[PDB]
Design a protein around this ligand. Structure first.
Ligand code: O1O
Ligand code: O1O
Ligand code: CO
Ligand code: CO
Lengths: 381, 381
């Protein structure tokens, strides 16, 4: 059931912003590892004396990497005279965030019809304000409210090119990498207590619970009206035999924060071939693959959706498969993106639910918890 | 003239340590950009609850990348019970360094016969102590004194495998990249005042001035007995028409620090081909190349050392050439390694001074200041 209860008009995920200590090195690493092109910049070369921000794109997916300069470069500025292109940026907040959490997502940004309205309605319905609406060059409005931990939900609305004050990157510096990633499918937070987190976020957005179908977690998914903005949230389950990886996250992250970003691929086999080629030469590593019993068990579960060749291709690449009542999900997870065992990436492709494809087709892979356990014990044999 | 006045026995450059906010992303970027292999690690997976440290190697060149974990992981530890593999590490120092300077070199490490003696003799001769000698697993001794800014000169001595507590990296995670870089040739600092800096460092090391032969700088080079440890230092020249890039460094770095690392290649043409292939796909960018007048002028200056083909190959790759009275230098400079216009890398190869090759053969390229200016005005035409 979908009550379509959004309290303001939400369009799509717009961008994800990482707060970094050095934006250049993270952006270059991510660009090569994920096949994303350098598309825009805001930094000293564009007159920004406050922060260095670099935008990577692949299809509609936008990853922004931002780090603070020395405050001394902008010590004469005030907010009315700022050279920052993102007016919510604050040196102290950014240094505090990165010293507390390490490299991670500061902003989950969604595009909306009217960011000022979304902010006002959100705060009127319990959202904790983080940065009030500001109109950039009379063209774009940005506003921010707290989501969980030190992660903000950022509203962006356009009157009619990323943000004013960003410059498009020269084609010499803009190599057209592309491994098939096309958009952000969902963004997942880890919190100590799931109940209060859902009440808060659903309270100020009107997002509804997306219907699903001991591994250390309880989770629920909040969704916009057309279920294209998807925000799952996890809490740890305590007292298990294997310590909850949600609790490990909370400890190493110094509390709640973004756990993983799921990136839709138009061809997950190509994406994984290209990413795995680069794992040991600057790119991303993947979690250890399931045993062959897992793929031997896939025929009985998805043999009507994937051929034997397509299943064997999943086994080569370590891809996981799950299914709901409406569609099928192919997914795989990276190892953590940085030093701490906190944030990681999921690559996904969804098959089914054609009307365009409806959001969340095939679910989020919760069935893969038990089937992985089954396969390991099976392969033990 | 070389008085061989070292106050203690110095061997070779041992490693360079970068202090990072996220060591993983910087190390992976550097590995791909420079062709260095992942060779050792000290991190959560090796029992280090304090800092993540990753070692890259190419030939004898060793780059170490270190970042702090949350202090909470090690809040129960004291120095007697520390799990840090580098006992000089301090969370607060590292966060302060990176927030002040951005990504940059914390330690210039040289191998010595006896790090405890080197420390004692250094401090007895004016060195400001930074970390006293500590013996690691009865096998290696490390000590640190201040060099300039927040950069330390690190002494390492071995009784008889990087450092105790580091583990060699699995070959799966250890791709054998190699673009030809083989060792650190010299490490260069920028200071506000050259005179006091040389007096200080030469005072506690016994290093001697290496003999040389308005562009915004004055420089001098300190050298060990066999002139294999080479430490140039620059100060700005004020009041010029073009603002000194040394002064820009000092402003963006928040004071003195390491300006560039010169990395010797056994085949600079191969190194530059391989590095330039990767500039726009995660590696390093190079400074804009000199005009063809520069290479048209190279025949008259080094036509007896390089063939026309070898000169044309320099023009393809943007390589600079200089010469002293004993040898010839091929060199090229990267753009800054990170967000700030501070640290960069030089790639060099030296030809001549065969006896082995003596240190500093061909100098440091100070002749390329005027010859570049000449070439630009010539090419203006
Ligand atoms: C994150 C995840 C999802 C997933 O996407 C998801 C949602 O999007 C919303 C619903 C809740 C949820 O879990 C699906 C399956 C698995 S799992 C175990 O079957 O592979 C995992 N999953 C883990 O739960 C833990 C780890 C660990 F390493 F951190 F422990 N990893 C690497 C995982 O991939
Ligand atoms: C650093 C350097 C050296 C060099 O290695 C060196 C020593 O090792 C010790 C002696 C003093 C010294 O200078 C040689 C030639 C040149 S230069 C202008 O001729 O190309 C440059 N040099 C600059 O001085 C300034 C910049 C700038 F971008 F920051 F301005 N760059 C990119 C440079 O490369
Ligand atoms: Co997911
Ligand atoms: Co040099």
């Amino acid at each position: 059931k979908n009550p379509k209860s959004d309290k303001f008009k939400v369009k799509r995920f717009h961008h994800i912003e990482f707060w970094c200590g050095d934006a250049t090195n993270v952006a270059r690493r991510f660009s090569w590892g994920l096949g994303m092109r350098f598309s825009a910049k805001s930094d000293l070369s564009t007159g920004n004396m406050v922060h260095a921000s670099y935008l990577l794109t692949s299809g509609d997916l936008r990853f922004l990497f931002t780090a603070p300069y020395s405050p001394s470069l902008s010590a004469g500025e005030i907010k009315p005279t700022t050279t920052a292109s993102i007016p919510s940026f604050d040196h102290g907040s950014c240094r505090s965030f990165f010293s507390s959490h390490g490299l991670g997502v500061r902003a989950v940004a969604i595009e909306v019809e009217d960011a000022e309205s979304a902010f006002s309605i959100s705060v009127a319905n319990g959202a904790i304000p983080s940065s009030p609406p500001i109109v950039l060059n009379e063209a774009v409005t940005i506003a921010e409210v707290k989501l969980y931990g030190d992660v903000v939900l950022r509203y962006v609305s356009y009157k009619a090119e990323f943000l004013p004050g960003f410059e498009r990157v020269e084609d010499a510096s803009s190599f057209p990498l592309d491994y098939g990633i096309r958009r952000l499918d969902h963004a997942v937070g880890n919190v100590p207590e799931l109940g209060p987190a859902l009440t808060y976020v659903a309270g100020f957005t009107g997002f509804h619970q997306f219907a699903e179908f001991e591994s250390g977690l309880n989770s629920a998914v909040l969704a916009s009206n057309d279920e294209m903005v998807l925000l799952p949230i996890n809490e740890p389950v305590h007292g298990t035999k294997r310590k909850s990886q949600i609790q490990t996250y909370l400890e190493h992250n110094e509390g709640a924060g973004l756990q993983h970003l799921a990136l839709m691929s138009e061809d997950i086999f190509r994406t994984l071939r290209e990413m795995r080629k680069r794992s040991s030469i600057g790119g991303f590593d993947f979690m250890p693959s399931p045993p062959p019993t897992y793929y031997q068990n896939l025929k009985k579960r998805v043999g009507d959706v994937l051929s034997d060749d397509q299943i064997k291709e999943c086994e080569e690449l370590g891809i996981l498969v799950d299914r709901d009542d409406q569609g099928t999900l192919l997914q795989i997870f990276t190892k953590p993106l940085g030093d701490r065992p906190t944030i990681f990436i999921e690559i996904i492709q969804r098959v089914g639910c054609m009307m365009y494809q409806s959001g969340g087709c095939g679910g989020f892979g919760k069935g893969n918890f038990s089937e992985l356990f089954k396969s390991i014990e099976e392969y033990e044999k």
